[PDB]
Design a protein around this ligand. Structure first.
Ligand code: KT8
Lengths: 172, 172
C-alpha cells in the first residue's frame, strides 16, 4: 500500500509548492507572448504507463513552450528548478485547446518499483496502487488550500488522450 | 511504514538518474574553474529536520557554486532541471573540504506528513520512519549499479555538522 505515501510526497514536495505560484506564472506567459488556460492538468494513467515525450503518447498533443521557471532554495540545493511545459491539443488538424500538461511522476516510481525485486511490490498490485494514489491525491486536493481552481486530475484507463484532455478543458 | 516507498522514489526518480551523469558533471566544474570531491554527499538527519539553507544549519558550511545543471525530458516536462550545489566546509576558519552536499528531500516529506491529520502518521513515528528510510536506501545503494564510489550517505542524530561531514570526507 505504498501509493498513499507517494500521494503525500507529491503534494508536500511539489503541488503545495507550485500551485500558489502558478496563476501568476501563467499570466506572465500570456502577457510576454499571446492563449493559455489557467489550471495545471495532471495526467493519471492507471496502467502507470508514463512516457517521457508527451507527444509520443499522442500526436494530437504538441509541445508549444515552457512556462517561466520557478526557483527556490530547497533542502540544500540553491535555486532548484520547477519547470512546466505548455501543450497545444489538436483535433481534426485544428488546435482546440492549450494548457499546462504533465504526467504524475510518482506513477513512474510505481511502475519501476514493480520490476525491482527487493521493493516487494508485485507486478499485479500496480493497478490498485494507481487507484489508491489517484484517490489519496483527490482527497488531498479537495482539502488543499493551495488548491482552488488551479489543477484538475485526469485519471483514465484504456483510445484518444487528446480527446480525453479536451473533455475536461471543455467543462469550464 | 511509509518510508520504504519514499526510499524507492528517491532512488528510481532521482539517484538512478543523476548518479550516472555525476562524475562527468564534476570533471567539467573542475576544468572550467579550479578542487572538488567526486561523490554526492547526501545528508540524512534522523530528527527529519531539513532546513532549506544548508548554511543556516551550520556556518562552517558555505555555498560556493552550482554544478552544471542536468536536463532531461521527464513525464511530459520538457527540459526538467536537476541542480546540485557545491559547498566548502570550514574548520577553525580554514576551509578543509569541498563537495556536492545536500539533504535527502524525502525526509522533508516525512516531517510534513506527521503534521497533516489525514496522512495517518503520528508525530512519534518520525524517528523510526527516518531510520527505515536510511536503512532501505542503504540496501538500494549497495546493490545499485548506478552506485559505485559516487555517493555517501551521512545519517546522524543529535553537535557540529561541518565536523560530521569532514569525518566521511577524510575516509578516502
Ligand atoms: N513533475 C515534477 N514533479 C516533481 C518535481 N519535483 C518533485 N516532484 C515530485 O513531487 C514529489 C516530491 O518530490 P521530492 O523532491 O520531495 O522527492 C523527490 C526528491 F527528493 C528527489 N528529487 C527529485 N528531483 C530532485 C531534485 N531536482 N533535487 C533533489 N531531489 C530531487 O526524488 C524524489 C522523487 O522525485 P519524483 O519521482 O520526481 O517525484 C516527485 C515527488 O514524488 C518537479 O520539478 N516536477
Amino acid at each position: 500500500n505504498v501509493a498513499h505515501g507517494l500521494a503525500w510526497s507529491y503534494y508536500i514536495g511539489y503541488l503545495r509548492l507550485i500551485l500558489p505560484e502558478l496563476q501568476a506564472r501563467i499570466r506572465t506567459y500570456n502577457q510576454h507572448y499571446n492563449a493559455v488556460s489557467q489550471r495545471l492538468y495532471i495526467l493519471l494513467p492507471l496502467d502507470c504507463g508514463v512516457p517521457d515525450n508527451l507527444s509520443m503518447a499522442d500526436p494530437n498533443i504538441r509541445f508549444l513552450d515552457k512556462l517561466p521557471q520557478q526557483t527556490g532554495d530547497r533542502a540544500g540545493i540553491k535555486d532548484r528548478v520547477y519547470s512546466n511545459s505548455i501543450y497545444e491539443l489538436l483535433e481534426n488538424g485544428q488546435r482546440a485547446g492549450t494548457c499546462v500538461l504533465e504526467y504524475a511522476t510518482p506513477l513512474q516510481t510505481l511502475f519501476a518499483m514493480s520490476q525491482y525485486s527487493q521493493a516487494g511490490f508485485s507486478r499485479e498490485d500496480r493497478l490498485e496502487q494507481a487507484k489508491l494514489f489517484c484517490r489519496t491525491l483527490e482527497d488531498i486536493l479537495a482539502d488543499a488550500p493551495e488548491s482552488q481552481n488551479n489543477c484538475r486530475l485526469i485519471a483514465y484507463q484504456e483510445f484518444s488522450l487528446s480527446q480525453e484532455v479536451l473533455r475536461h478543458l471543455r467543462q469550464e
